[PDB]
Amino acid sequence: LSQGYFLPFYSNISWYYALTKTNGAEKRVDNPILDFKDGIYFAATEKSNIVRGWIFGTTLDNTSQSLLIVNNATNVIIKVCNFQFCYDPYLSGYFHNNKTWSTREFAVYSSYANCTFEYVSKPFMLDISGKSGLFDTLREFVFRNVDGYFKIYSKYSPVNVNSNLPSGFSALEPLVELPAGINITRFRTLLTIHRGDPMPNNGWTVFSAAYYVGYLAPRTFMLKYNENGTITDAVDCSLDPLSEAK
Amino acid sequence: CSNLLLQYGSFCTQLNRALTGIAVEQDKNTQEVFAQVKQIYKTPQIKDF
Amino acid sequence: DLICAQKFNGLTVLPPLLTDEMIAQYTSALLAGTITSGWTFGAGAALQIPFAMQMAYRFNGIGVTQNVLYENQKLIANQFNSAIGKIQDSLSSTASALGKLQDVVNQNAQALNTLVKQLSSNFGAISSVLNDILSRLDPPEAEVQIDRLITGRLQSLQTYVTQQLIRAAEIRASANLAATKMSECVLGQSKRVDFCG
Amino acid sequence: GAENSVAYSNNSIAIPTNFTISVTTEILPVSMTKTSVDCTMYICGDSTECSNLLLQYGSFCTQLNRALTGIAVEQDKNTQEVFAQVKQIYKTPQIKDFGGFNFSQILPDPSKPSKRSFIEDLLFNKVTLADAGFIKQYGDCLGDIAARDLICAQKFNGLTVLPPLLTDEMIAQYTSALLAGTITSGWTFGAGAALQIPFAMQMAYRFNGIGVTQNVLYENQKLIANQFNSAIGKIQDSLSSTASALGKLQDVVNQNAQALNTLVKQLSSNFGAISSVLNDILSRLDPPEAEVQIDRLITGRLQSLQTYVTQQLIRAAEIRASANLAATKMSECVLGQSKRVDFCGKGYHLMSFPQSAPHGVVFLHVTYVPAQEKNFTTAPAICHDGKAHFPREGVFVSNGTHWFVTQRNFYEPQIITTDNTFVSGNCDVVIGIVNNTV
Amino acid sequence: CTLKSFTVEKGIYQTSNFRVQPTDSIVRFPNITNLCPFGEVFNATTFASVYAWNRKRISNCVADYSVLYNSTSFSTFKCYGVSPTKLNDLCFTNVYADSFVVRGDEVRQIAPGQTGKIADYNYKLPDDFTGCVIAWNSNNLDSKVGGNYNYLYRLFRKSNLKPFERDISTEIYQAGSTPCNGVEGFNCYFPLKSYGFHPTNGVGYQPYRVVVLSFELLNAPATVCGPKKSTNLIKNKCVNFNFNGLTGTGVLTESNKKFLPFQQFGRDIADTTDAVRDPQTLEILDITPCSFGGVSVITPGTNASNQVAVLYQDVNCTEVPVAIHADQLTPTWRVYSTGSNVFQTRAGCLIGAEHVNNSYECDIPIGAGICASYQTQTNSRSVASQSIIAYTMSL
Ligand SMILES: *[C@@H]1O[C@H](CO)[C@@H](O[C@@H]2O[C@H](CO)[C@@H](O)[C@H](O)[C@H]2NC(C)=O)[C@H](O)[C@H]1NC(C)=O
Ligand SMILES: *[C@@H]1O[C@H](CO)[C@@H](O[C@@H]2O[C@H](CO)[C@@H](O)[C@H](O)[C@H]2NC(C)=O)[C@H](O)[C@H]1NC(C)=O
Ligand SMILES: *[C@@H]1O[C@H](CO)[C@@H](O[C@@H]2O[C@H](CO)[C@@H](O)[C@H](O)[C@H]2NC(C)=O)[C@H](O)[C@H]1NC(C)=O
Ligand SMILES: *[C@@H]1O[C@H](CO)[C@@H](O[C@@H]2O[C@H](CO)[C@@H](O)[C@H](O)[C@H]2NC(C)=O)[C@H](O)[C@H]1NC(C)=O
Ligand SMILES: *[C@@H]1O[C@H](CO)[C@@H](O[C@@H]2O[C@H](CO)[C@@H](O)[C@H](O)[C@H]2NC(C)=O)[C@H](O)[C@H]1NC(C)=O
Ligand SMILES: *[C@@H]1O[C@H](CO)[C@@H](O[C@@H]2O[C@H](CO)[C@@H](O)[C@H](O)[C@H]2NC(C)=O)[C@H](O)[C@H]1NC(C)=O
Ligand SMILES: *[C@@H]1O[C@H](CO)[C@@H](O)[C@H](O)[C@H]1NC(C)=O
Ligand SMILES: *[C@@H]1O[C@H](CO)[C@@H](O)[C@H](O)[C@H]1NC(C)=O
Ligand SMILES: *[C@@H]1O[C@H](CO)[C@@H](O)[C@H](O)[C@H]1NC(C)=O
Ligand SMILES: *[C@@H]1O[C@H](CO)[C@@H](O)[C@H](O)[C@H]1NC(C)=O
Ligand SMILES: *[C@@H]1O[C@H](CO)[C@@H](O)[C@H](O)[C@H]1NC(C)=O
Ligand SMILES: *[C@@H]1O[C@H](CO)[C@@H](O)[C@H](O)[C@H]1NC(C)=O
Ligand SMILES: *[C@@H]1O[C@H](CO)[C@@H](O)[C@H](O)[C@H]1NC(C)=O
Ligand SMILES: *[C@@H]1O[C@H](CO)[C@@H](O)[C@H](O)[C@H]1NC(C)=O
Ligand SMILES: *[C@@H]1O[C@H](CO)[C@@H](O)[C@H](O)[C@H]1NC(C)=O
Ligand SMILES: *[C@@H]1O[C@H](CO)[C@@H](O)[C@H](O)[C@H]1NC(C)=O
Ligand SMILES: *[C@@H]1O[C@H](CO)[C@@H](O)[C@H](O)[C@H]1NC(C)=O
């Protein structure tokens, strides 16, 4: 039995879309400044890897230390700096004629200076090329700011569903703990919008994706571990009478 | 204080198990004394004893 | 009140599964089978027999042949009534129904009240008021005092539960005695001397 | 329960005209798993400095081990008091002509290596004994790959299970001697030497001991034998399928196993210390600073051992009460015929058969349990020659205009005669009286 | 010694454990042996300001503070959760520096429970710090003859800092209810102020360098280890072992359990490590207790005799010398480890009692239907001796 900040079972989770309607008529790009509160749970369902970054902070400009996570093609780049973000941050995926990706635009911040933390992990490449079908991947993260530590927990899973966050139990393994001593209250996601030659207007287009924001609250959870040390089952004591009896 | 009691130990499951055994034993005592039969006989209206 | 303090301090009294009226219905069924069948309902189905005959067999079962009962029948009945009448009256004013039952009830109530009053024991802490500990010390320095209080209150609960286990052992001995008596004294006629009177 | 209003009868009786020899089964714990607890192995493990701290702390565990040794010696004494019973080891009576009564599945067979009967086989199969009944060697715990079992943790943490002194096979030998003395002598072997008696006539005497004369048996002997065999077969099948043999015994075994597992899992309690890992305390703090945390751990684990021993003493009090009850039922229903009501079965007790079971005894109580009732009219002290007449072992029930003096628990009407009814007192003083006979 | 009495009555007694005392110590620290930079940490030209305090990884290292002894004397070396004496016998999976400069009178503020401008607006050590704090006067280094006006400290702040949380604002603080819109004034405050460490100031006003070494030890592979010298490995004897700071007393054996690639030790149902990955050979060694529980001593009584029998509970008679590790026992014990009268029971292995095929009544109940008795063999076998026998109990 462990008392901690958990995502309560069957909680009200905010679903956000990123999709182009018929023949580029209705464009859905949504980067609202959500509240961090006591850490968050963020789930991304996508076919093309479009949800590629995060912004964390309090004032979200050069007034306060901020955090940027960019999971672009070359690496994952975690930068705790005085990020003077522009009004509508997003990444722009540049597509080369040679079927390669040159996704370097940086429409997220206008500048950065006098900052503390830089981090790059696990040299890897992840494609954002358009794929026919439905959302093929579900990527889950838990973000916390505890005792001067920015904790990220992750779980990656290939799933094929029509939409809306397939029901199931996910235990997120410790991904990375960062020694960033910053105050975080508000955050916004970084999506990537396509550019190149998808349509000769050379405007803005997006691929289908969805992201999900849930709020951590102080609960008590009954967790079970296997010999590997992996959480294989969890009970939310406050969910219902049966879970409280458990 | 709940966190301190959680890391301190898990005595109260044992304590409540003992108390639940006591309560079930009280119910079983009442069953073995009073019930002891599964036919409820009503008062014999004919009172010429 | 005392009971409000017990409820607010996590101590609850679970009601017995059998209500007093179901207990009375069991006892009425036993009395009906005893004054209509006598003892045969303790083995199989109740076997009707007039009371003045099962009393004759109960005489037969103490070495006093039935020739004694009917030849004094009326007197016997009245005497029993007189006898029952006496416990009809003394029980009304002697407070003998308290006996060991009032002692059991007072013991349980006093144990619960003692458990409640033990919350004012410091147990070596700065105070027994957990909120005054928590509103005067930071979590580190309050760890020691709250751990002392936790150990003390856990030991109080352990003592309460152990004494309840011993009390339930003696209550179970008395309940086994009551079951044996109702199976023998009520469902038959015990030949044991000074067992049913 | 069902409402069964019985019509009180100022002058009528209900005499059961047909019985039902029923083999009720009860299960009584006789012993509990006796355990030994090592002082330092549990509290400290392999530590010289923790051993010194426990030495200067106090000498609690000598008293704790004295209590546990008393519990174990009492467990052996309970097993002697119930199973040992008669020391004379009577072997199976090869002559098996028991008047129809079979005992095939209750008397042990030499075919299988263990002299344990088939009913005993089902009883031993039903109780799991998943903790100590199985044999675990030190080589098993020394070499393992997947994960250390609960029993290995208990063994490595000072918690050992001492085997009972009486082996299950010699427990079965006690029960076989008791069964042989019961089916050849009946009850005379509970007082002196066994006095041989053919089973049918001691069965008739066991009816005589419940107010039902022997006139029932030799007249119904084949039916009696077949009824007992059918009852024993039915309880055999129910034991095979209903898992009712668990009852009290499985609860006791699970209680002991759960207590030991709680003791093991409670080593992870901090008790206010920095951690429950004694070596992490000892590998991060100096002996002065480590003494505070190790003393907190010593107090917590000493309290855990004290609690374990305290409910072990309470559980052994319950087990001793149940074993005294088992000895009373063994020496009042296997060595005799108890006249106590509902002591050895719902009906009128005939005998009982002890069966070995894991840490307990199963009694197959054979009881009378009459049925097939029939209303008659009854009037006592019939007035003949102006004198009251009372029925000696009779009831004075009536057929149509015919009055018969009848046995209590079995409808066997007989004519009124002076050798069956005794006269005393002038008639007319008695309240309900009527002669018209003898 | 178990009964705590020089006179022992006839019976069977569960002696606790006194056979084995380990005589060897085993240290298995990994291959690092590289002197950790304490001149690039402690001997830095300039530390950070307490408001913008630095933090660094330590990476693979041997942490021997002995190298710093003739470099400076640490006035404050309070350690939390770890004793200083044990700092040389440990391995740390993660270590952080947290270096800054304060005033002397404020070093007492670098502690879990503290209030003050440093402990409320600047650093705020947590309540479960479990690292430790080193501090030393640095008036010789961090002091200019005109006063060093670096090392800013946050003087005002709208709320107390969280544990280990940094805060660089450069904003404007409002004392009253009159907005400043980011400009200075009379009610407007710049939240940072410079110390001004002149050399000839009181010791409370002189600079102190604080390194808050926050270190955590987990099941991850050890990163920083102490100066302890790694010995050989003994794989069949009861020893004292210390692999990565995880000390204990037991028998190490070859194990076939599978660990995660980054797991250093396993755990039992209790909080006892039953397996450890030796970080030099990377093998997995099972850990077994030195103490063997189950040894019972069968005595006819000290006044009667001094010969005893020993029942080893639930063990193979062949394995008894290996089970109790008879090599390390005294020869008087090794008499009862092997021999001729080594009768095997279902309860266990009985050594020291001459098993007889006769069936006597029980005298000392052993277990599994076997009893021992002190019988007169002098009149039995010509001229023989009073001796202990074991047999199947008679029913
Ligand atoms: C983290 O930042 C938030 C907002 O940036 C701080 O919350 C504000 O605190 C000030 C001063 O107490 C209040 O006047 C505001 O009303 C607060 N706003 C909100 C939305 O809470 C918070 O105090 C900061 N955390 C720390 C530890 O300093
Ligand atoms: C992904 O983001 C990283 C971070 O900005 C990019 O790497 C930078 O590349 C520029 C120019 O090549 C360098 O000046 C920076 O030093 C790099 N920073 C880091 C942290 O590596 C990278 O180019 C981006 N990938 C793509 C495909 O645009
Ligand atoms: C980042 O912070 C530094 C430190 O304050 C700034 O550098 C100082 O700038 C002021 C201008 O007001 C000068 O008076 C100081 O001499 C500078 N000090 C140093 C060490 O350079 C720097 O300007 C800040 N960055 C930006 C982009 O403004
Ligand atoms: C504990 O972890 C190990 C290693 O990851 C698991 O063993 C793997 O199991 C999967 C699925 O059966 C196999 O595909 C891998 O090849 C296995 N690897 C190894 C090293 O055995 C093990 O299953 C985990 N434990 C549990 C209970 O899931
Ligand atoms: C036996 O004792 C009873 C008393 O228990 C006697 O009955 C009593 O007789 C006296 C005198 O008539 C009355 O005053 C009492 O009220 C009667 N008591 C009862 C219970 O009826 C009875 O006479 C005695 N008989 C003999 C033969 O001694
Ligand atoms: C008394 O009861 C027994 C048992 O119920 C009766 O015997 C049964 O007779 C029926 C009909 O022939 C059979 O089907 C059953 O199998 C018999 N049971 C046994 C145990 O043998 C018997 O007939 C009854 N006697 C009277 C007079 O009612
Ligand atoms: C979730 O929260 C939103 C915002 O308050 C609310 O409008 C909506 O009804 C909530 N949904 C549920 C199922 O509670
Ligand atoms: C007795 O039991 C055995 C084995 O169950 C069976 O073969 C035999 O027929 C039975 N005899 C009687 C009379 O029931
Ligand atoms: C006996 O009389 C009662 C009361 O009328 C009746 O319910 C019952 O069926 C009768 N039994 C017999 C066997 O006649
Ligand atoms: C039987 O009782 C009747 C009625 O009182 C009586 O007339 C008759 O004489 C009695 N018979 C005998 C034998 O006494
Ligand atoms: C019993 O009563 C029945 C019905 O009254 C009658 O037919 C029968 O002859 C009587 N027999 C005896 C023995 O009284
Ligand atoms: C009850 O039986 C008695 C004795 O036979 C008799 O005197 C009385 O009148 C009967 N009462 C009734 C009406 O049942
Ligand atoms: C270091 O050792 C040398 C050699 O004796 C000594 O001269 C020097 O003073 C020492 N360092 C300090 C700070 O004393
Ligand atoms: C610290 O650095 C100075 C300058 O580089 C050097 O003179 C001094 O010897 C160093 N001290 C130590 C202990 O390395
Ligand atoms: C550790 O060093 C020793 C001695 O140089 C060597 O034999 C061993 O292979 C090394 N192991 C590793 C894992 O580096
Ligand atoms: C002891 O080990 C030997 C050698 O394998 C084996 O034959 C014997 O059965 C073992 N004893 C046991 C398992 O009790
Ligand atoms: C006792 O009998 C066994 C049975 O074979 C025999 O092996 C042994 O040598 C005999 N003598 C003893 C045990 O002293």
CSV table of N, CA and C in Angstrom, one decimal, chain E residues 154-223:
chain,number,residue,atom,x,y,z
E,154,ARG,N,19.1,35.5,-2.8
E,154,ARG,CA,17.8,36.0,-2.9
E,154,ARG,C,17.3,36.5,-1.6
E,155,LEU,N,17.0,37.8,-1.5
E,155,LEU,CA,16.6,38.4,-0.2
E,155,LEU,C,15.1,38.3,0.1
E,156,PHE,N,14.3,38.6,-0.9
E,156,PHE,CA,12.8,38.5,-0.8
E,156,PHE,C,12.3,37.5,-1.9
E,157,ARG,N,11.2,36.9,-1.5
E,157,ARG,CA,10.6,36.0,-2.4
E,157,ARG,C,9.2,35.7,-1.9
E,158,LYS,N,8.2,35.6,-2.8
E,158,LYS,CA,6.8,35.6,-2.5
E,158,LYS,C,6.4,34.3,-1.8
E,159,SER,N,7.3,33.2,-1.8
E,159,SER,CA,7.0,32.0,-1.1
E,159,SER,C,8.3,31.2,-0.9
E,160,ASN,N,8.2,30.3,0.1
E,160,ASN,CA,9.3,29.5,0.4
E,160,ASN,C,9.7,28.5,-0.7
E,161,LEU,N,11.0,28.3,-0.9
E,161,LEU,CA,11.4,27.4,-1.9
E,161,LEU,C,11.1,26.0,-1.5
E,162,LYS,N,10.9,25.1,-2.5
E,162,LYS,CA,10.6,23.7,-2.3
E,162,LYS,C,12.0,23.0,-2.2
E,163,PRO,N,12.0,21.8,-1.7
E,163,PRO,CA,13.3,21.0,-1.5
E,163,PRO,C,14.0,20.9,-2.9
E,164,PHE,N,15.3,21.2,-2.9
E,164,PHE,CA,16.2,21.1,-4.0
E,164,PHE,C,15.7,21.8,-5.2
E,165,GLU,N,14.7,22.7,-5.1
E,165,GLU,CA,14.2,23.5,-6.2
E,165,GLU,C,15.0,24.8,-6.3
E,166,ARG,N,15.5,25.0,-7.5
E,166,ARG,CA,16.2,26.3,-7.8
E,166,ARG,C,15.2,27.3,-8.3
E,167,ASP,N,15.7,28.6,-8.3
E,167,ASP,CA,14.8,29.7,-8.7
E,167,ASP,C,15.7,30.9,-9.1
E,168,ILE,N,15.7,31.1,-10.4
E,168,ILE,CA,16.3,32.3,-11.0
E,168,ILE,C,15.1,33.1,-11.5
E,169,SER,N,14.9,34.3,-11.0
E,169,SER,CA,13.8,35.1,-11.4
E,169,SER,C,14.2,36.4,-12.0
E,170,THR,N,15.1,37.2,-11.4
E,170,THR,CA,15.5,38.6,-11.8
E,170,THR,C,14.3,39.5,-11.9
E,171,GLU,N,13.2,39.1,-11.3
E,171,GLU,CA,11.9,39.9,-11.3
E,171,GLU,C,12.0,41.1,-10.4
E,172,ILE,N,10.9,41.8,-10.1
E,172,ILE,CA,10.8,42.9,-9.2
E,172,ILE,C,9.8,42.5,-8.1
E,173,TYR,N,10.2,42.5,-6.8
E,173,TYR,CA,9.4,42.1,-5.7
E,173,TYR,C,8.6,43.3,-5.1
E,174,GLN,N,7.3,43.0,-4.9
E,174,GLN,CA,6.4,44.0,-4.4
E,174,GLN,C,6.2,43.8,-2.9
E,175,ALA,N,6.7,44.8,-2.1
E,175,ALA,CA,6.4,44.8,-0.6
E,175,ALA,C,5.0,45.1,-0.3
E,176,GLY,N,4.4,46.2,-0.9
E,176,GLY,CA,3.1,46.6,-0.7
E,176,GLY,C,2.2,46.4,-1.9
E,177,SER,N,1.0,47.0,-1.8
E,177,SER,CA,0.0,46.9,-2.9
E,177,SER,C,0.1,48.0,-3.9
E,178,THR,N,1.3,48.2,-4.4
E,178,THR,CA,1.5,49.2,-5.4
E,178,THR,C,2.3,48.6,-6.5
E,179,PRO,N,1.7,48.3,-7.7
E,179,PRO,CA,2.4,47.6,-8.7
E,179,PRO,C,3.7,48.3,-9.2
E,180,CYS,N,4.7,47.6,-9.5
E,180,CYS,CA,6.0,48.2,-10.0
E,180,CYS,C,6.1,48.0,-11.5
E,181,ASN,N,5.3,47.2,-12.2
E,181,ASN,CA,5.4,46.9,-13.6
E,181,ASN,C,6.8,46.7,-14.1
E,182,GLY,N,7.7,46.1,-13.2
E,182,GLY,CA,9.0,45.8,-13.6
E,182,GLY,C,10.0,46.9,-13.4
E,183,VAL,N,9.7,48.0,-12.7
E,183,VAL,CA,10.7,49.0,-12.5
E,183,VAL,C,11.0,49.1,-11.0
E,184,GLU,N,12.2,49.7,-10.7
E,184,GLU,CA,12.6,49.8,-9.3
E,184,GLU,C,11.9,51.0,-8.7
E,185,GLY,N,12.2,51.3,-7.4
E,185,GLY,CA,11.6,52.4,-6.7
E,185,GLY,C,11.9,52.4,-5.2
E,186,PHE,N,11.0,52.8,-4.4
E,186,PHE,CA,11.1,52.8,-3.0
E,186,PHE,C,10.4,51.6,-2.4
E,187,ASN,N,9.2,51.2,-2.9
E,187,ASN,CA,8.5,50.0,-2.5
E,187,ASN,C,8.8,48.8,-3.4
E,188,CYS,N,9.7,49.0,-4.4
E,188,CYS,CA,10.1,48.0,-5.4
E,188,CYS,C,11.4,47.4,-5.0
E,189,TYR,N,11.5,46.1,-5.0
E,189,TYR,CA,12.7,45.5,-4.5
E,189,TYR,C,13.4,44.6,-5.6
E,190,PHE,N,14.7,44.7,-5.8
E,190,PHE,CA,15.4,43.7,-6.5
E,190,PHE,C,15.6,42.5,-5.6
E,191,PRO,N,15.1,41.3,-6.0
E,191,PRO,CA,15.1,40.2,-5.0
E,191,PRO,C,16.5,39.6,-4.7
E,192,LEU,N,17.5,39.9,-5.4
E,192,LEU,CA,18.8,39.4,-5.2
E,192,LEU,C,19.8,40.5,-4.7
E,193,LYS,N,20.6,40.2,-3.7
E,193,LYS,CA,21.6,41.1,-3.2
E,193,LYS,C,22.9,40.4,-3.0
E,194,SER,N,24.0,41.1,-3.2
E,194,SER,CA,25.3,40.6,-3.1
E,194,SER,C,25.9,40.5,-1.7
E,195,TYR,N,26.6,39.5,-1.4
E,195,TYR,CA,27.1,39.3,0.0
E,195,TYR,C,28.1,40.4,0.3
E,196,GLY,N,29.2,40.5,-0.4
E,196,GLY,CA,30.3,41.4,-0.1
E,196,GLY,C,31.3,40.9,0.9
E,197,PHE,N,31.9,39.8,0.5
E,197,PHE,CA,32.9,39.1,1.3
E,197,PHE,C,34.2,39.8,1.4
E,198,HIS,N,34.4,40.8,2.3
E,198,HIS,CA,35.7,41.4,2.5
E,198,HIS,C,36.5,40.4,3.3
E,199,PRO,N,37.9,40.4,3.2
E,199,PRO,CA,38.7,39.5,3.9
E,199,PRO,C,38.7,39.6,5.4
E,200,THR,N,38.8,40.9,5.9
E,200,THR,CA,38.8,41.1,7.3
E,200,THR,C,37.4,41.5,7.8
E,201,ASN,N,36.6,40.5,7.8
E,201,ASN,CA,35.3,40.5,8.4
E,201,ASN,C,35.2,39.5,9.5
E,202,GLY,N,34.2,39.6,10.3
E,202,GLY,CA,33.9,38.6,11.3
E,202,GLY,C,33.7,37.2,10.7
E,203,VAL,N,34.0,36.1,11.4
E,203,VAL,CA,34.0,34.8,10.9
E,203,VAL,C,32.6,34.4,10.5
E,204,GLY,N,31.5,35.1,11.0
E,204,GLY,CA,30.2,34.9,10.6
E,204,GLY,C,29.9,35.6,9.3
E,205,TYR,N,30.7,36.6,8.9
E,205,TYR,CA,30.5,37.3,7.6
E,205,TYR,C,31.5,36.8,6.5
E,206,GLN,N,32.4,35.9,6.9
E,206,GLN,CA,33.3,35.4,5.9
E,206,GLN,C,32.7,34.2,5.1
E,207,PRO,N,33.1,34.1,3.8
E,207,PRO,CA,32.5,33.1,3.0
E,207,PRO,C,32.8,31.7,3.4
E,208,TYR,N,31.9,30.8,3.2
E,208,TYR,CA,32.0,29.4,3.4
E,208,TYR,C,31.6,28.6,2.2
E,209,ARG,N,32.4,27.7,1.8
E,209,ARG,CA,32.0,26.8,0.6
E,209,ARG,C,31.3,25.6,1.2
E,210,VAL,N,30.1,25.3,0.6
E,210,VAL,CA,29.3,24.2,1.0
E,210,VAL,C,29.1,23.3,-0.2
E,211,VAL,N,29.5,22.0,0.0
E,211,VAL,CA,29.2,21.0,-1.0
E,211,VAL,C,28.2,20.0,-0.4
E,212,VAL,N,27.0,20.0,-0.9
E,212,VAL,CA,25.9,19.2,-0.4
E,212,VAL,C,25.9,17.9,-1.2
E,213,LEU,N,26.7,16.9,-0.8
E,213,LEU,CA,26.8,15.7,-1.5
E,213,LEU,C,25.6,14.8,-1.3
E,214,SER,N,24.6,14.9,-2.2
E,214,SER,CA,23.4,14.1,-2.1
E,214,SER,C,23.6,12.8,-2.9
E,215,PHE,N,23.7,11.7,-2.2
E,215,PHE,CA,24.0,10.4,-2.8
E,215,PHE,C,22.9,9.4,-2.5
E,216,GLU,N,22.5,8.6,-3.5
E,216,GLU,CA,21.5,7.6,-3.4
E,216,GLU,C,22.1,6.3,-3.8
E,217,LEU,N,21.8,5.2,-3.0
E,217,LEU,CA,22.2,3.9,-3.3
E,217,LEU,C,21.0,3.0,-3.6
E,218,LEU,N,21.0,2.5,-4.8
E,218,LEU,CA,19.8,1.7,-5.3
E,218,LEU,C,20.3,0.4,-5.8
E,219,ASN,N,19.4,-0.4,-6.4
E,219,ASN,CA,19.7,-1.7,-7.0
E,219,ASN,C,20.4,-1.5,-8.4
E,220,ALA,N,20.7,-0.3,-8.8
E,220,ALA,CA,21.4,-0.1,-10.0
E,220,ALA,C,22.9,-0.4,-9.8
E,221,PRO,N,23.7,-0.6,-10.9
E,221,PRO,CA,25.1,-0.9,-10.7
E,221,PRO,C,25.8,0.3,-10.0
E,222,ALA,N,26.7,0.0,-9.1
E,222,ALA,CA,27.4,1.0,-8.3
E,222,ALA,C,28.2,1.9,-9.2
E,223,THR,N,28.2,3.2,-8.9
E,223,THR,CA,28.9,4.2,-9.7
E,223,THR,C,30.1,4.7,-9.0
